[model samples]
Target chain A: MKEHQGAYCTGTYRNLLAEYGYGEEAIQRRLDETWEQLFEGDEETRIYYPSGEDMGYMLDTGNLDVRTEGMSYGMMMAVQYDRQDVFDRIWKWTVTYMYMTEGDNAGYFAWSCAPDGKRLSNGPAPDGEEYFALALLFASHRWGDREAPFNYGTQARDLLRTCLHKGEDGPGYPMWNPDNKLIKFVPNCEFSDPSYHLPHFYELFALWAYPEDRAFWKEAAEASRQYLHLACHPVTGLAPEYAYYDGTPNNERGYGHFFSDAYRVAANLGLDWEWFAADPWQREAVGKIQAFFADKEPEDYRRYTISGEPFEEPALHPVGLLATNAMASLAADGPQAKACVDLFWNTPVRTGKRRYYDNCLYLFALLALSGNYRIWMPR
Target chain B: MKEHQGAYCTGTYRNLLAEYGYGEEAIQRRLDETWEQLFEGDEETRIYYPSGEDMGYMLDTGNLDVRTEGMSYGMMMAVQYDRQDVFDRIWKWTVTYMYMTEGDNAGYFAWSCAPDGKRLSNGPAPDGEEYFALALLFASHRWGDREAPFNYGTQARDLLRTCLHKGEDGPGYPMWNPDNKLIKFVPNCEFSDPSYHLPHFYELFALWAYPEDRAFWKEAAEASRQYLHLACHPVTGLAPEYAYYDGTPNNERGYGHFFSDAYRVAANLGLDWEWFAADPWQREAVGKIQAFFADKEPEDYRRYTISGEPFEEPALHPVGLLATNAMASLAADGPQAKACVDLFWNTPVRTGKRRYYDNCLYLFALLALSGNYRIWMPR
Candidate 1:
């Protein structure tokens, strides 16, 4: 018998929707509808809004501001669906408004900004930078390079280069810990966001990064996979939003619980397993996560300690939680997998003020589960 | 599409071994071989010993003593395979030697005794009682009740009554905590052995116990399931040997780690899910457990905190650990399920003093995975 290989090796992606017996046409239509709702729907539904003819920004509607988290997420979502125009507009707005030019955060994009392009926080979130670089690399492979800012290949390589060597010869600190190869919560911070460690992206970065840094990305991928094993609760599979280098929850600001930012952990693991299949552990990890939520209603979703205790405070992004749980089906082969996918299929994208993060995750899950989320391999 | 119901409702059990593509004939042969090796094989393989013409006992070979744990396990094994002679002999020996008739432990079986029928302990372990009651109930269903001493139905019901009401009018305490409906590690203890929890058996007891006590068993089944959610490490799914009523580990005697006593947890959950499917979380719980062991070599198994930190003490029953992990496949639907089942299949049963407990678990796994271990519903 020929053993199964993942998409990175076979160039074949799984349409979990189809595998679960949904019609291909309906899967495709659902994917497109979700994309349209997040990018082109009315104000209540849309997360991406055009700044002018050539620039667009993904608004964090709940906060009524622009954030690199949303901008980078929009770019990744756009590139996966081959929406080059949408990708470029978000990238342009990100560079124009969020990019940091000086100080200890130089070369890193400001994590948050106001709608009128005013920088809100000077420090960069490593999650956004990692996503931004990976999306740019994908864009370069899918649509090729253009002018200075539009030269996606050059931009991606340069961004990655700075991420590694930023503090070596300059005023800025690297986004990842030099000793550990673990991505940091912020460029100057020592702690990490469990949700920010994306080994799947690092795997691709090993092939596309600058030659001298390729090996570093490869090691980083392995480090992230091992780190995740420690970061997540062994039985519950819940991860803290921020964790120390050793993987213990960093409760400094009370972000050390399963909450909004931690929701991405499942979505990332699912995509990683779907793409690489390098770590079989991801299947069990996602299975634990899906099972933890098996008995929980989306409306009752709330902040929870990584060991599985639920708090009185309700979740800020319950729709996003559902999307990630559904995406976990890519790796989770447990009975809970079907229920998660079915729940997401039955759930409409979120509306109202907190819709931005939720809808972005919903679209990513929609694309990934339908196999529309693909690696834009170099031609 | 028709939905699936568990054996408790459908009167059919899943043959996971056959489902995994093993031949039915081979599976049946393997189950028989495992049973023979544990009961009727050579000294190095067998744990059951004839005490007299009318009685027999299961030796805890490593300890060179007879424990209610081993005797009860032997009865369960015999009843499942319709070995009436074996079940009857073990029951006679247990009542004659291990049963406590005085003091606070009156009506409870002494946890351990000598092969010569001399009692070694006055207190009762709840695990042994639970298994003893369930196994006796099954024997009554399969072989029918007989005269005094051999009247399996009366004996089982009487034992269960003692377990729940011993403290009401006499000196003994109930095996379970009245307020929480949680089983105690022993009749006199406040804490529990997570491995001692058998919600699946309680679910059956709800229908078979004395009419007035049926509701208590039903509530116990629910409480055990909920307690497990708190007892097991959310990510690793490992449970400590001893835990407080609130489900936190009790380290007073260094039994608060995942060690010999804790191996039964996965096996119990697997059977529970197979027989009842009442708690979907068991599926994920077993998945986490299997995943935690996926990369671990059984030969290197050791004591570990339930959160998954390994101690240097070598496991006394690695073979038993493997069997339980394989048994977990009954509930685990993750990719790790195949590897666990395969590992157990390739490993031979232990052949030493320690073989007693390991082979007991080994036979149970073999019976369970082949769908031969079953509930003998009343005739």
Candidate 2:
């Protein structure tokens, strides 16, 4: 197989499809087919849950409810495809149901909700906020922020402030510690989930966030870059699901092990390096992860520790694992990196419950692999 | 012409059509037709905004927004008609968009939302809470309460308790003044809108609110009744749009004289008397209000001073004027009572931009006048 070099979000990048001996038509075919499957496909694969006349929620179909993850992912997908309708529907639902307008966490959203829009919890989740803000910013750039509520850019700016400004001793907890720039396990809690880290997003946040907030986001970019090193195992490059500020796995509630939440690190590193070319840590990190997973087959994928010992428990999201490993190719030049993408290309989007998370990662990996998961430049 | 009164929450009452010689079938026909017009008819009058697969909002059509007032009103109408789908859609939207899960207003809802579901204000309107609580209680009784947030009875009780307790202190402001048990113009303001006084709802709150809140609502019911006496002109029963604790017009916003907001004074008095008959003052108040409007045509209804001085400006909601005047019959012994009912029965629901508020009041007036606006007591 031809090995494609790393690409960054510069004015142009390597055409991975052509680099890997595939045609533009093949890339377009995959995108069209996958978008149809996840959006307007049969009930089992569709994530968009249309609510009112003009609003809807992206359900975590497996759970049969709404979550920040699916909603933000839906927005990202819509913005990429230039589907303003779906973007607005998800945005309205997120604001209508999940966006908190009160308390310390007022700007952030509740992480989970029933499909009918009853909030499962009031707490804010940072991963959701970051994605929402980025998507909104993209939305504003793409759609020219419309009259109110749909004033996408303004909402994005305010919400970013809401997420960043909190986390102090006073009101609602912020997504991350202002001191370390590490995200929280949940806003109210001091610890953080490794999977929530997104330095590549911080790169864009630094450029487009509110004038006053640009500096903090830049610092957050650096701090997040530094924090990942401590969070992941030096030899294995694996992270625990939850960790303390110092990067040691936080064993509270049995979360110290590398598990479902740890799966995003490779994908994040891949995207960060692809976008900013700011650090080579992404390159090395992706290589370690892909190499570690090379021997593992999807049917018997297992949970593991940061030091690489496997648990008896089977992987909850093997498809998600494959997607992230595939996304790692955006940065990694390692042998397994190409293999991961090849495997991903052959795999189909999962259909059924629990498919929400897997397919979201699946679609994302597809976009990243095809160089289609792009930041929409302002129109 | 027979006056046909005796309207109460107690199962059976007067047939205004038969008593006033409008015909039973004709009265039923009008009620049925109007309900169809508002709920299932043309786009202009319909309130429901089916949000997701099974949820929606009741649009505050005139303002092109969503208000808790409209949400609760929709549910109330739904329960009256036993339309569970409409009731659930509205309830879902109310909880999804307006319901606050954080801060001092946790149990309360934001008063106003842009049509796209952005909260325009951070505060809760007492009128909204009262309607929401009463409507939810009715919903629980009509259709057995389901799981949370649809556990209508529990949510109602909890919300009532929150409204009462929050009045005193903490971060959030309360709806009423704890000392006087009078609902403010808003939770944060000391003054009140005469139209917002819903002693009818308060009476029910006294029965269904949390045990500790029962006495507070009972006292609130009494205080509101007394407050109305002071707020209205003794001779003409014309209440100001807004009044201070001393019952004088609150001119801060120039919302002092009888105007758009003052319209509800008649409807509130009518229902208060219909439900409890606890205030003899209501009987006289209703008669005086009808007497004051006796000579006024719907097209020329004018804004006025409490002491009965007419304003040069036309009444903003002439349809609402007709509706409230007709609703006054529940306590009126005045000669104009029959005439008011006749005018209302003949008038079609208002159309165009200002129709939402007018239509809601018009429907309620029809129900109250026909002795169909019965309260749903929780089983």
Clashes of each: 9, 14
Error of 2 at B5 (Å): 73
In candidate 1 the C-alpha lDDT for residue A167 amounts to 83
The DockQ-based CAPRI class assigned to model 1 is: incorrect
After the best TM-score superposition of candidate 2, give how far the Cα of residue B204 lies from its true spot, in angstroms.
65
What does candidate 1's lDDT look like per residue over A228-281, in tens digits?
999989999999999998889999999988999999999999998888888888
lDDT tens digits, residues B273-323, model 2? 767777887888888989878755677667777877666677878998889
TM-score of chain A of 1: 0.98
Write one digit per residue (lDDT tens) for candidate 1, span B1-379.
Answer: 0012256755667888888888988888888887788788888698898767989989888999999999999999999988999998999999988888788888888988989988788888788888899998998899898887888888889999998998898766898899999999888788898998888899899999999999999999989998999999988999988999888999998888999889989999888878766665676689789989998999899998888988889899999999999998988764699889989989898997788889889999998998878988999
Off by over 4 Å in 1: A1-379, B1-4
Residue A141 lDDT (model 2): 86
Runs of candidate 2 exceeding 4 Å displacement = A1-9, A167-170, B1-379
lDDT of each structure? 0.87, 0.81
Candidate 2, residue A218: how far the Cα is off, in Å: 0.4
Clashing pairs in 1: A233-B235, A234-B235, A234-B236, A235-B234, A235-B235, A235-B236, A235-B237, A236-B234, A236-B235
